[PDB]
Ligand binder design. Structure first.
Ligand SMILES: Nc1ncnc2c1ncn2[C@@H]1O[C@H](COP(=O)(O)OP(=O)(O)NP(=O)(O)O)[C@@H](O)[C@H]1O
Length: 280
């Protein structure tokens, strides 16, 4: 699939840099013809077939294909895609309230209500994605953006579909690997992966939202991964002494090693609490 090859600079003006990754950089931008603002994600292309630098065409096209199919309040949308010799430039919906990661860093820890307000939106977005058999595979605070953080109940959108895959055969087997602190045991063990992996990540995010602490984080990546595979975590009283037993129950049913025994996204929405790379 080829994309628009005219110079993006002839149609957009860029500004502040929103995020910087290993093979991608995101900058705020404005479309000249409408005055509307977006987030331009510049993904570096591979210069040869056998290169570690850059992202393969296959991987870029997968992210674009998935983004083109989604339209939901809690997920980022794709506006246009350009490309040149060195990059594929995705013009994405702008989320200017910053990362949930930075929001949590400035506030330390939330109340269960504040935590559930964020979680419910994440669950709604994931429910949409999983309904389309799309596994995100990289869910974490850094990949959740707020529309406006200067409001008591910030609205959010899930971003970064660089590892997202269509799961049409129930599972994918291709060494997909996200951030150690949030990956499920099956990722750590290089086993077939499915929508269940995202549910584990949601459990980790929930633990963090409520305590301000990471459940499996070790001093090294290998330690973290070892902790994940052994489901080595506990609810420290210093952090959870005033957290409800139901909230812990919700987390406990997500941080389950056997993917088949883990709550599904539908289960999470009906749960009593809710119901109204790897080397370094
Ligand atoms: N739509 C958006 N609106 C605002 N900020 C965004 C948006 N998309 C991404 N960002 C920011 O840019 C950062 C990096 O974007 P991301 O999509 O995660 O790239 P990446 O997948 O890490 N790229 P790469 O390093 O090439 O694998 C994020 O963590 C956000 O802070």
């Amino acid at each position: 699939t080829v994309f628009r090859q005219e110079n993006v600079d002839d149609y957009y003006d860029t500004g502040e840099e929103l995020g910087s990754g290993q093979f991608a950089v995101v900058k705020k931008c404005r479309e000249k013809s409408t005055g509307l603002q977006y987030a331009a994600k510049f993904i570096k292309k591979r210069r040869t077939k056998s290169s570690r630098r850059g992202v393969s065409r296959e991987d870029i096209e997968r992210e674009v294909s998935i983004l083109k199919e989604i339209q939901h309040p809690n997920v980022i949308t794709l506006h246009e895609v350009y490309e040149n010799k060195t990059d594929v430039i995705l013009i994405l919906e702008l989320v200017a309230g910053g990362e949930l990661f930075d929001f949590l860093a400035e506030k330390e820890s939330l109340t269960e209500e504040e935590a559930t307000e964020f979680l419910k939106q994440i669950l709604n977005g994931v429910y949409y994605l999983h309904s389309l058999q799309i596994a995100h595979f990289d869910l974490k605070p850094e990949n959740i953006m707020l529309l406006d953080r200067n409001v008591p109940k910030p609205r959010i959108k899930i971003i970064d579909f660089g590892l997202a895959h269509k799961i049409d055969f129930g599972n994918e087997f291709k060494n997909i690997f996200g951030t150690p602190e949030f990956v499920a045991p099956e990722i750590v063990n290089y086993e077939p992966l499915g929508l269940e992996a995202d549910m584990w990540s949601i459990g980790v995010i929930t633990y963090i939202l409520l305590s301000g602490a990471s459940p499996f984080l070790g001093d090294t990546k290998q330690e973290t991964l070892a902790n994940v595979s052994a489901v080595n975590y506990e609810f420290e009283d210093e952090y959870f002494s005033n957290t409800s037993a139901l909230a812990k129950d919700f987390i406990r049913r997500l941080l389950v090693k056997d993917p088949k025994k883990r709550m599904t996204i539908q289960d999470s929405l009906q749960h009593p609490w809710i119901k109204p790379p790897q080397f370094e």
